[PDB]
Design a protein around this ligand. Structure first.
Ligand SMILES: Cc1ncc(C[n+]2csc(CCOP(=O)(O)OP(=O)(O)O)c2C)c(N)n1
Ligand SMILES: Cc1ncc(C[n+]2csc(CCOP(=O)(O)OP(=O)(O)O)c2C)c(N)n1
Ligand SMILES: Cc1ncc(C[n+]2csc(CCOP(=O)(O)OP(=O)(O)O)c2C)c(N)n1
Ligand SMILES: [Ca+2]
Ligand SMILES: [Ca+2]
Ligand SMILES: [Ca+2]
Ligand SMILES: [Mg+2]
Ligand SMILES: [Mg+2]
Ligand SMILES: [Mg+2]
Ligand SMILES: [Mg+2]
Ligand SMILES: [Mg+2]
Ligand SMILES: [Mg+2]
Ligand SMILES: [Mg+2]
Lengths: 524, 524, 524
């Protein structure tokens, strides 16, 4: 067998059947004789390729396979890799290298010092020393990406390798099963369980790795047993809890002082599947107030190491959540009372308040809808106004890198064909990966894109106005016609200048047979 | 003085007055109180920011200053940095880091292991150890980018540094003059000159560093004195010679065998300002045929080291070209005869042959026009059909990374307001950095964009059809309306489905007061 | 031909005939059939291997070739590479890698991520993608190390590569000549010369690159013409000037304030072949006092970039020194008056004052002796008491990394068989690379080692006593018998407990036919 044949067999035997890519000449020898059981999803720029694959992996809870062109293609994707790193997305990123005979002279398209290019945003990064090593290297990539803590990996392959003879002993790679589905030993788990049972006023904080593990339901059981309020860790990339469950308390403010104040009076705080903590704004104060002890369960040693406070346990979130939910006592305390519904913001017949948009989306969207957020100034309100009962219902750029939601929403919709995906994206954010729209059109992936148009980088005006920063350039983005951009890439386009039009536009979009973009005129 | 004040003073004292950027919160403390003598050029995505700055630097022959947002913004720009590396573009790339107090906990927007992110695509990459070091670090960045061989550099700055007190001793940085304007010592230069004088059938090969140094005219004198044919080194990022000069022989094929065959019978081949050589296609054979000796003058030690053949001299191209042109004897040999005009390709009343487009552009464009090329399957014909008499008249992605020409054409037009810029870009390539169009609209930079629409990644179909590669996915890009995309970003749009319409569309574009995009229907 | 045969031919054609090494199994396929025209110099530890090669390269003014074993051998040498980096030593460091077939599984002795190991202490670091690329890669290593600014480079080679067929086109590598022997263009050089001619009170500061270039004599002429005092830049790795020449003013203190005070009243300070400046102690103040302008000529862009003050010119030191010395006017000013001889320190019949040792060495050593210094607390006095008339007469660890002088003194003596090498090394420093002694014994390289034994890390007690640092552990090194260590490695050993014995011991050592170690009892 050839390296080509062996590698594709390894991929299919490991459950991979889709290649997200933007092709180049170094990659043609890999893509030729493309297996009929595989499917190729083209995107027009590499940030889009990786964004789509990322959404697909996060929603499918399995690795996604990517193929890019050498250094330039890899480089175009590096902003997208910074989100993937933060979201622990299992992405296998492959890139074509020049033929081995021309690497030395650094012919056009040589990826120089290739393995170093994507660092430090990958778990593993490699170029094999020979053609026959390629299948083995691919095996390593698959498993490195898939093991906890999951993350992106990078493999560079000289284009002449594919046609070379494979090592017959590579067959041992095909069916390898690698598990990191582990939890704390019985003795120490019993100690933890007793600490939770003994807490007088426990609180629970959940991060994105809960949703990634589909540990949501186990966490619901855990919170019900402990009669504990549940928060989502700050800068949340996913939603790990039903947002209308009686225990739910919403998204934590991303500040040190704010969080310690919030946790005051809680004697034991159990954090599951989150860094401790993904703060954003500088908000100096105490990490924890006297009387509060913190215990973190994380799948990532790097998270456990850098927590400024508390104990930590490094284990699989699915395994740990299930064990805890089934071991803890049912507290005799009263179940927390559900949070009241959000207030209705006054809305005239003109431009839309973001709050109005979210309320309307909540009213009209199916109960199993999936939302993506890249409307940076409206996150707090979004979290308060969308009832998300099911797992996998929310995604937000994990590293804060814009250009995620638009392509990721396409990958999510591909992963979940029966759940309507609705991406709420600011007019600023929409441009970063605008060309992703074409993929939705071409493959008829029926994502709905809601563009919140207020003509400015709103979150920046806020961050600025705060530090009283004056005379800051580059904050306004006037003069973009999103209906025209949608037409450019073959996506049906609608406009909503008021509530009447927003409702009508959503009705049409929800009925449509393909992707739809709605440009919403929002208040400045 | 503050670090902010000191740094801006250093920048202006070193000739920098423009910031190309896409802002983020880590950068607001740098951008606040933006100096009134500076101007900020916003682009909507970082590949575009860097592309624009790159075109500006290459055309202006001076460093360009860039400001990006942390890791995600830097990462979005890394494909653009791969071109900049290959073109020796003096780019000072700065990126905002989280406040020092929050770096440890890895708060949202922390650029982790920041200096390693852009490697290996930068000459120098650094984050200062303290606020007061920032001006010094900026000084280093300016000079590292500017010294031969020029290239991109990276500086990460924690956002809290800007408001801190500067070291008063930083004033010594302001007026530092650093020179690498050097040439071979007299003794060895005399030896080289004698070798050139003694050659019976010399040839000259010129690369992009000739145009960067504005050594074009000196090279013309050198070729006239030596009565030598002149080629452009393969995969040319710039044009280093008047394309209708009697000595000009055009663009060399990017193959080992092709080049040695081309140089056969030439006893001395002098290469100036090029790698030896930027081959592309695998084309095995002899590096040089018996009887041919090669001498390379390059500004880059890395180029000199990796040449598989010939002698090399590492020096400034401007200094070396001037010295050689003024020292060599006037050969009594006959001046080479100019190349004949290209053939006129048969053209019906339907879709345009690329050859027709280039002929028409040559007929109608001003004699001092500047062209950019990202129409990958038509490069050979473009080089044959455009009369480029002046320096700085051609740019092509130096690392072959698409997404360069569209934004770079905007930067070039900004650098050269009196020379009409015309970017010829394929329908595939146009998408990578499509959002750059907005910058042209917003700042009224009157670049003309000619989109060659054939609905496919044509160069890939060629590279494939060659290696008889069958069943390759992802090669077609149907369903893009470029007039709509232009409208989306506020750029006047025209369509040309035939020659009559192409002429009319060019007449209108050349008369227009702002940027114009022409979608040309080209043959499949 | 094989890769083995081709590589050795390349080495000999490029002037390499010696391999400094400590062998391992990955290297046996390279070392087998060792060419009879080559010679192998074994050392017992890798810090010693590299130290010896470093001294050899610095003294010979040509590249030295090193062969180490995989990661562990390379790693053992990394302290030595840190000195080599700072001294711009042209070292070609090769290391054996596992066979390509076993790299993937990471068999014992696999050098993982090999190219990254020696960073950031090398100019270039690489592992070839195939066997046939090895000769080309070696070519690159040779030239990267040899081009200005010179420095160490690293090449990792899988052991199975050597027996493979070489590319016949590799013959083009054999005779490549690469030059960086460049100087400032005529126009700007004339401007510099006029500035020097116009100076009312010029000063000259010289660094190690002067001695490396053998520009010493040209600098003498330059100083005589300008009638200028001459200093050696701080933390000097070499001696660039005759220390008894009337213009000589000695070693500059390694402090910011001290240097600006020293240069006060000098209107133009010309620095040649030094960083600006290699300060050590924190000594805050003005970089330069008002009235002083600085101009630096350096072979290293990294030096030019980081200078906190002055103008800079990046060029070859030999070419620049020669040009300046021959272009400047003869000033009518009076030649500086020679520095008075150092005072004679009172010396009783007991333990030796370091000053006594240096005075005695100066009295007894031949006029063409070469000294190495790793007696860290006595450097200032050494510089004042040794008359060094000739180039290549002094070496001191360029990065301050101990373990340099002992092995380097062996390499220097190998390079200069007719000049007596005398290494003055502290009792602390002597241990770092003690096993190097064996190489001197085995090859009968007649270096004299003078061990200054005061039983303590004297320089550290000083640096401590200064910052009033109390209760510092680990500063004393009692209980070492250096005569026994010398006997252990087969080197003749003598002891000097007083002046009478020091004179007798030196008389014997200077007459000896092989290496000699003298343990001198110095004052605590
Ligand atoms: C790749 C990248 N570039 C820049 C930024 C900085 N940034 C953060 S929020 C923001 C504004 C986004 O504006 P929009 O999408 O319109 O939403 P709004 O803030 O108006 O709600 C910017 C530019 C970023 N996070 N990522
Ligand atoms: C960032 C990047 N992605 C992918 C490629 C691979 N590539 C090279 S040419 C090409 C096709 C370009 O098509 P178009 O711009 O329409 O020009 P045509 O080839 O049709 O003339 C592609 C995808 C690249 N060079 N850079
Ligand atoms: C590899 C290395 N380790 C440690 C040091 C720190 N150091 C600098 S001077 C010194 C003392 C050297 O003592 P000795 O050689 O006896 O000379 P003395 O200071 O007594 O004159 C030490 C340990 C260093 N420079 N390099
Ligand atoms: Ca907005
Ligand atoms: Ca095309
Ligand atoms: Ca001592
Ligand atoms: Mg157990
Ligand atoms: Mg599915
Ligand atoms: Mg990197
Ligand atoms: Mg000269
Ligand atoms: Mg201009
Ligand atoms: Mg000159
Ligand atoms: Mg010698």
């Amino acid at each position: 067998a050839s390296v080509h044949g062996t590698t594709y067999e390894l991929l299919r035997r490991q459950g991979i059947d889709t290649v997200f890519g933007n092709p180049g000449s170094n990659e043609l020898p890999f893509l030729k004789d493309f297996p009929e059981d595989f499917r190729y999803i083209l995107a027009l720029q590499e940030a889009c390729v990786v964004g789509i694959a990322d959404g697909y992996a996060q929603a499918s809870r399995k690795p996604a396979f990517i193929n890019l062109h050498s250094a330039a293609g890899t480089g175009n994707a590096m902003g997208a890799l910074s989100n993937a790193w933060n979201s622990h997305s299992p992405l296998i990123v492959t890139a074509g290298q020049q033929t081995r005979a021309m690497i030395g002279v650094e012919a056009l398209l040589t990826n120089v010092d290739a393995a170093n290019l994507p660092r430090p945003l990958v778990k593993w990064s490699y170029e094999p020393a020979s053609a026959a090593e390629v299948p083995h290297a691919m095996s390593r990539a698959i498993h490195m990406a898939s093991m906890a803590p999951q993350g992106p990996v990078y493999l560079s392959v000289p284009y002449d390798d594919w046609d070379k003879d494979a090592d017959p002993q590579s067959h041992h790679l095909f069916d390898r099963h690698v598990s990191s589905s582990v939890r704390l030993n019985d003795q120490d788990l019993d100690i933890l369980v007793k600490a939770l049972n003994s807490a007088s006023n426990p609180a629970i904080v959940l991060g994105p790795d809960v949703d990634a593990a589909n540990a949501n339901a186990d966490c619901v059981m855990l919170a019900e047993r402990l009669k504990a309020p549940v928060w989502v860790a700050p800068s949340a990339p996913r939603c790990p809890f039903p947002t209308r469950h009686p225990c739910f308390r919403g998204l934590m403010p991303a500040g040190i002082a704010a969080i310690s104040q919030l946790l005051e009076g809680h004697d034991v705080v159990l954090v599951i599947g989150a860094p401790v903590f993904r703060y954003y704004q500088y908000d100096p104060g105490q990490y924890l107030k006297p009387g509060t002890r913190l215990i973190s369960v994380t799948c990532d040693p790097l998270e456990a190491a850098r927590a400024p406070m508390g104990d930590a346990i490094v284990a699989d979130i699915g395994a740990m959540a299930s064990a805890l939910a089934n071991l803890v006592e049912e507290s005799s305390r009263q179940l927390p009372t559900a949070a009241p519904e959000p207030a209705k913001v006054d809305q005239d017949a003109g431009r839309l308040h973001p709050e109005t948009v979210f309320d309307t989306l909540n009213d009209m969207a199916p109960e199993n809808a999936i939302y993506l957020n890249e409307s940076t100034s409206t996150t707090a309100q979004m979290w308060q106004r969308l009832n998300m009962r099911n797992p996998g219902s929310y995604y937000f750029c994990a590293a804060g890198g814009l250009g995620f939601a638009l392509p990721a929403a396409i990958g999510v919709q591909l992963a979940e064909p029966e759940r309507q995906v609705i991406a709420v994206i600011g007019d600023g954010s929409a441009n970063y990966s605008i060309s992703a729209l074409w993929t939705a059109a071409q493959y008829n992936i029926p994502t709905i894109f809601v563009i919140m148009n207020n003509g400015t980088y709103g979150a920046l005006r806020w961050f600025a106005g705060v530090l009283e920063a004056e005379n800051v350039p580059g904050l306004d983005v006037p003069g973009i016609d999103f209906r025209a951009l949608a037409k450019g890439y073959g996506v049906q386009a609608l406009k909503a200048d008021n509530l009447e039009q927003l409702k009508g536009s959503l009705q049409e979009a929800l009925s449509a047979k393909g992707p739809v973009l709605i440009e919403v005129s929002t208040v400045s």
